[PDB]
Design a protein around this ligand. Structure first.
Ligand SMILES: COCCN(C[C@@H]1CCCN(C2Cc3ccccc3C2)C1)C(=O)c1cc([N+](=O)[O-])c2cccnc2c1O
Ligand SMILES: COCCN(C[C@@H]1CCCN(C2Cc3ccccc3C2)C1)C(=O)c1cc([N+](=O)[O-])c2cccnc2c1O
Ligand SMILES: *[C@@H]1O[C@H](CO)[C@@H](O[C@@H]2O[C@H](CO)[C@@H](O)[C@H](O)[C@H]2NC(C)=O)[C@H](O)[C@H]1NC(C)=O
Ligand SMILES: *[C@@H]1O[C@H](CO)[C@@H](O[C@@H]2O[C@H](CO)[C@@H](O)[C@H](O)[C@H]2NC(C)=O)[C@H](O)[C@H]1NC(C)=O
Ligand SMILES: *[C@@H]1O[C@H](CO)[C@@H](O[C@@H]2O[C@H](CO)[C@@H](O)[C@H](O)[C@H]2NC(C)=O)[C@H](O)[C@H]1NC(C)=O
Ligand SMILES: *[C@H]1O[C@H](CO)[C@@H](O[C@@H]2O[C@H](CO)[C@@H](O)[C@H](O)[C@H]2NC(C)=O)[C@H](O)[C@H]1NC(C)=O
Ligand SMILES: CC(=O)N[C@@H]1[C@@H](O)[C@H](O)[C@@H](CO)O[C@H]1O
Ligand SMILES: CC(=O)N[C@@H]1[C@@H](O)[C@H](O)[C@@H](CO)O[C@H]1O
Ligand SMILES: *[C@@H]1O[C@H](CO)[C@@H](O)[C@H](O)[C@H]1NC(C)=O
Ligand SMILES: *[C@@H]1O[C@H](CO)[C@@H](O)[C@H](O)[C@H]1NC(C)=O
Ligand SMILES: *[C@@H]1O[C@H](CO)[C@@H](O)[C@H](O)[C@H]1NC(C)=O
Ligand SMILES: *[C@@H]1O[C@H](CO)[C@@H](O)[C@H](O)[C@H]1NC(C)=O
Ligand SMILES: *[C@@H]1O[C@H](CO)[C@@H](O)[C@H](O)[C@H]1NC(C)=O
Ligand SMILES: *[C@H]1O[C@H](CO)[C@@H](O)[C@H](O)[C@H]1NC(C)=O
Ligand SMILES: *[C@H]1O[C@H](CO)[C@@H](O)[C@H](O)[C@H]1NC(C)=O
Ligand SMILES: *[C@H]1O[C@H](CO)[C@@H](O)[C@H](O)[C@H]1NC(C)=O
Ligand SMILES: C[C@@H]1O[C@@H](O)[C@@H](O)[C@H](O)[C@@H]1O
Ligand SMILES: C[C@@H]1O[C@H](O)[C@@H](O)[C@H](O)[C@@H]1O
Ligand SMILES: C[C@@H]1O[C@H](O)[C@@H](O)[C@H](O)[C@@H]1O
Ligand SMILES: C[C@@H]1O[C@H](O)[C@@H](O)[C@H](O)[C@@H]1O
Ligand SMILES: [Cl-]
Ligand SMILES: [Cl-]
Ligand SMILES: [Cl-]
Ligand SMILES: [Cl-]
Lengths: 524, 527
């Protein structure tokens, strides 16, 4: 099994998937390894290789800090990289159905994290099911995370910012120039990603360089207008200097600061990343996208409001309990080992952790808007209240807002609200429908009947899988005897719920809560 | 001839013709020494006796007060202006009695509203003859001193201790205790009722130990003491007295001379300086009102209320739908009685600055936020109705619901009503809605006069309210009839049930405007 790429040949492997076969290529390199003097620089193009590259194993994962908060716990360790870490990590994966097609539509995955972690080789990102069941080609790449991917000295090509974004862009360029040889259609390419990946996707809509490299976009629990998504030009600079000071690299010329940083062991850069910002929360993006004047020629909010982006169809949505995951990593009184009931004042110190710079007036206005109880007793009210605060502000409200303004320019947008909790979800029952736990359903994992998912979950997974694939192909997320999914329009603003019971059409998702974040919190 | 022997001498009345029957009325019985000369600013002095027969056949003087002349010739405003001569000699009261004379009639006592600055018991809408004819109750109403003449305060100084007007009310209540039996009344069945400042005065009599043996039950219409305008702190009363002294050229070193100086000023110069003792000044300002005097009020009313130190008895409480509207046309920009008064977002914002002078710019945006979750964006009346509801909820509805909640918690039956009908004869524009004060004519049974151009529905409604009010007084329960009538349930802190009052359908409901009152009770104190 061998395919001819424009930089040399690559050998794949056959996978057995539901009585059929999927042709998979794991670990095709798409750029020069960013080592030594190439550290912190935009990815450089590759030269041809004479012999055969064996793409039969997942490549290295990009350098990153590892979540070791809960040793032995699957809930956290399932997100930890499952291959060796290395600065040599610019590779991608390609899955193809068997037999092979002539012009299949292509789905490209951009993994999530806080831009600090993640890799394409995770079990939940396995594209072989998607290749078998809907006969699409599935691509996923590794991109640089943390300071190695997003360190910024604006105007200076030695570390300009958004390197990790340019990695993604280079992988998309690779698909354009190579995917036809695999039987793919470069004129029908759909990006999708979760959280930071979804925000990465939304950034590709803004950036001129990415205009011609894909067709449509899917944004799961993320967008660039999320409060955590983009760092100001000034706060990025403050973090680069904090990092240099912490690494014994403080200088006067910055050209020499970068020189010093290039001599540091990767671990010394990684292990200091947490300290570059004082108000460190688990939602902190220490090094993420910034306005570099290259990938982002201007402030994202401005570009969105002026409508200077790629005009195309989008699929957008969020989970029911996006906030809970972040509460167990710092907020007081919360644990995965108890029911995590908290008191009015525990709620208050929580708000102080997630809103460090906000006045006590503002942390009271917030407390106000989220205590108009339906039931006075509970006592779980506050534990769910703080959850909803984080979730609404960090994920749900920015997403509705992004979808509203994107639709305003005459493009079809579709919005979803994912309400089902996995029967195998390793976290406690109070955390609900968590950040990131729609991903296994999008990748068709419950289709594996030997895998301890319920029948109801397989049916649901099949719907999402079908809808996602049809959206990629046709621009409309329809199924087969299935609820018709309507466009999100700024007037009526309809969205679809996804659960095992009854998939309904509804309106004005959490419009009351999002009212506060969009039209009052900015004035505090 | 019509003559009753009171403990201060004999008094002569008159016969009135009311609905084919007769009502005996005694108008202008004096209940205290005229607060004249050196008696100015002092608690009312008891009456001695008169040898002859006092002729109670005309309304007495109204107490000194400024007159509303914003709209000369306009009935809507001038109907509240006094209809007798003004004078410091005003401590008189009125008595209406059914005929034939009763044996042990229940007595309803009316305390008029205002900002504690105006008002009088002789208004057309305060006519007790209908109530006496239709429900066979005895109706009593008194005049009490208003403005600085009634509430000027130098706390601890018997020359002007504060709350004189409240003590005026209280002495009239003593008069009823001592004399009403001679008219055929039951002094052990006495019910206070009043509107606004009258309602606030009523709620204070529940607090004040001195009044506790002087009445049985209470009715509060559009007012209570916990309203932001109702009660002035001990220091703010003193500072206003001094501001007044400075404004009139009466500043001294001892207080005895300031009072001695203020006593020589013409009643009119004190009146013209009342508005200036408070720096900001809105149409809701109570320049001189009740204060904590250490006599009538031994502590801040909220403390006594929270501690349960009040008279334990039944109460009837309620408010109107558009309490705020009346005050917007007397100062808020863009508003007029001659337009539909549709306003813009920023007119709304400058309006807010008029009614909340001491509040941060943050708070004036918080209010705006809580009150702009529009159902229909346009709807151009949105902001005009938003501001009305702000003033109304903050000043009347929420403090009333709050009072009723806290009062009910100590185990007495409270009933709450919500008055929603606009009068077919209301002289104000339609956008002002169900205004402050325009339930009074329905409570006094005015639409029962068929010669007066009210709708039939309105007579039905009035007759209903009159029945409930009188039944509350007699039995402690505002029932209409046992059958073919909506059950009016007690207000409890849990369900918070209230009754709506209108021509269409009187229904039982819960948690009146709970979302709005939430903001005022649990967020506004934190701004
Ligand atoms: C959906 O994926 C599930 C795994 N998570 C979500 C978890 C949330 C709580 C924190 N932990 C772990 C990560 C880690 C790494 C080393 C040591 C300790 C910890 C704590 C991850 C991510 O990859 C992830 C991570 C960040 N961040 O680093 O701040 C985000 C920031 C803004 C928006 N989205 C983010 C996001 O989605
Ligand atoms: C049910 O009464 C119907 C008539 N009004 C209500 C009108 C409202 C608009 C203002 N005018 C004033 C204007 C003005 C100027 C010069 C001389 C006389 C007047 C009359 C009265 C009152 O008697 C009355 C009055 C005040 N106050 O004067 O501050 C209240 C304060 C707090 C709570 N309630 C109050 C209240 O109910
Ligand atoms: C008027 O009615 C009252 C009752 O409200 C009569 O009452 C006194 O009433 C109390 C109970 O309320 C009794 O304990 C007393 O014994 C009563 N006193 C007397 C002398 O009977 C009162 O008598 C009635 N007055 C009349 C009918 O003239
Ligand atoms: C007491 O009354 C005074 C007099 O109005 C209030 O006023 C301020 O400060 C001085 C008083 O010494 C005046 O000259 C100013 O004009 C007043 N300020 C304004 C903005 O008018 C004072 O606030 C009151 N204080 C108390 C404790 O009651
Ligand atoms: C309204 O309801 C009250 C119940 O609270 C009725 O009260 C009774 O009235 C009779 C005389 O009419 C008294 O002898 C009883 O003592 C009262 N019962 C009490 C106080 O519990 C009242 O009659 C009802 N009236 C109408 C018109 O329905
Ligand atoms: C009992 O009294 C009710 C009043 O509460 C009367 O019903 C009303 O009838 C008049 C016309 O006769 C209508 O204008 C009202 O709208 C009716 N009110 C209702 C239905 O609530 C009637 O006298 C009696 N009704 C019954 C059902 O016995
Ligand atoms: C939907 C579709 O056909 N897309 C492409 C089309 O642009 C091209 O002409 C041809 C190449 O094989 O087919 C494929
Ligand atoms: C805003 C500013 O001027 N200072 C920030 C502050 O976070 C800190 O003083 C410094 C070192 O951490 O980094 C920068
Ligand atoms: C394996 O690869 C061969 C070609 O080498 C191909 O014919 C076959 O379909 C693939 N899958 C299986 C079943 O081995
Ligand atoms: C590539 O795969 C082939 C067949 O499995 C194997 O013989 C060879 O060692 C691998 N590496 C290279 C460089 O060919
Ligand atoms: C930067 O500093 C280095 C050594 O400190 C020096 O050689 C170089 O000329 C400097 N470059 C600029 C542009 O200042
Ligand atoms: C499914 O769950 C069972 C326990 O009932 C476990 O033994 C097995 O390893 C699980 N299989 C997978 C694929 O997770
Ligand atoms: C879904 O919608 C597309 C729109 O082109 C249509 O072609 C198709 O028949 C529908 N159903 C399925 C299962 O694709
Ligand atoms: C459990 O979590 C920690 C103990 O590890 C503690 O702070 C908290 O009080 C506990 N939660 C509950 C609900 O008891
Ligand atoms: C009216 O009062 C009574 C009747 O109840 C009696 O004195 C006479 O009929 C009338 N009195 C008058 C008008 O002098
Ligand atoms: C109407 O009231 C007066 C003029 O009669 C004026 O102050 C105000 O601007 C007018 N407003 C509207 C909306 O007519
Ligand atoms: C008649 C017009 O409307 C009213 C007044 O507020 C204006 O001054 C103008 O005279
Ligand atoms: C909290 C402080 O923020 C700033 C940095 O320069 C310091 O190293 C430290 O991390
Ligand atoms: C005399 C008083 O001084 C002080 C001011 O706040 C009052 O308005 C008044 O002028
Ligand atoms: C006043 C109204 O009269 C009619 C009745 O049907 C209602 O219950 C209510 O009492
Ligand atoms: Cl940030
Ligand atoms: Cl009659
Ligand atoms: Cl209108
Ligand atoms: Cl009843």
């Amino acid at each position: 099994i061998i395919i001819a790429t424009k930089n040399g040949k690559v050998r794949g492997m056959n996978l057995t998937v539901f009585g059929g076969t999927v042709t998979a290529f794991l670990g095709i390199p798409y750029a020069q390894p960013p080592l030594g003097r190439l550290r912190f620089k935009k990815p450089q193009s590759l030269t041809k290789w004479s012999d055969i590259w064996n793409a039969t194993k997942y490549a290295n994962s990009c350098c990153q800090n590892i979540d070791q908060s809960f040793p032995g716990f699957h809930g956290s360790e399932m997100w930890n990289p499952n291959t060796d870490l290395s600065e040599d990590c610019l590779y991608l994966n390609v899955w193809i159905p068997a037999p092979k097609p002539k012009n299949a539509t292509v789905l490209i995955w951009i993994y999530g994290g806080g831009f600090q972690t993640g890799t394409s080789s995770l079990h939940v990102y396995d594209g072989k099911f998607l290749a078998r069941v809907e006969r699409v080609i599935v691509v996923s790449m590794n991109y640089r995370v943390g300071a190695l991917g997003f360190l910024a000295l604006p105007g200076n090509p030695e570390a300009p910012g958004n390197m990790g974004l340019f990695d993604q862009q280079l992988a998309l360029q690779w698909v354009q120039k190579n995917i036809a040889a695999f039987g793919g259609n470069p004129k029908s390419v759909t990006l999708f990603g979760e959280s930071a990946g979804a925000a990465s996707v939304s950034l590709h809509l803004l950036s001129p360089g990415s205009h011609s490299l894909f067709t449509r976009a899917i944004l799961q629990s993320g967008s660039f207008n999320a409060p955590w998504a983009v760092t100001s030009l000034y706060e990025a600079r403050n973090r680069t200097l904090n990092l240099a000071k912490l690494t014994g690299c403080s200088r006067e010329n910055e050209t020499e600061i970068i020189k010093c940083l290039r001599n540091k062991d990767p671990q010394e850069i990684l292990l200091n990343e947490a300290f570059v910002v004082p108000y460190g929360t688990p939602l902190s993006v220490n090094f993420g996208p910034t306005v570099d004047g290259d990938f982002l020629t201007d402030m994202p909010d401005i570009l969105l409001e002026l409508g200077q982006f790629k005009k195309t169809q989008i699929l957008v949505g969020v989970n029911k309990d996006e906030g809970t995951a972040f509460l167990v990593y710092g907020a007081p009184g919360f644990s995965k080992d108890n029911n995590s009931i908290i008191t009015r004042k525990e709620f208050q110190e929580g708000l102080k952790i997630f809103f460090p710079g906000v006045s006590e007036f503002g942390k009271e206005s917030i407390l106000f808007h989220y205590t108009d109880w339906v039931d006075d007793q509970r006592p779980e009210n506050y534990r769910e209240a703080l959850g909803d605060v984080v979730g609404d502000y960090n994920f749900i409200c920015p997403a509705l807002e992004f979808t509203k303004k994107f639709s305003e320019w005459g493009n079809n947008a579709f919005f979803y609200y994912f309400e089902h909790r996995s029967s195998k979800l390793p976290w406690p029952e109070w955390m609900g429908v968590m950040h990131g736990y729609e991903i296994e359903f999008v990748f068709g994992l419950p289709l594996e009947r030997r895998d301890n998912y319920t029948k109801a979950e397989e049916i649901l997974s099949r719907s999402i899988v079908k809808r996602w694939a049809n959206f990629a192909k046709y621009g409309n997320p329809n199924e087969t005897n299935s609820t018709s999914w309507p466009v999100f329009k700024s007037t009526e603003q309809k969205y679809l719920t996804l659960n095992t019971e009854s998939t309904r059409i509804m309106t004005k998702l959490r419009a009351q809560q999002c009212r506060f974040w969009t039209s009052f919190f900015p004035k505090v």
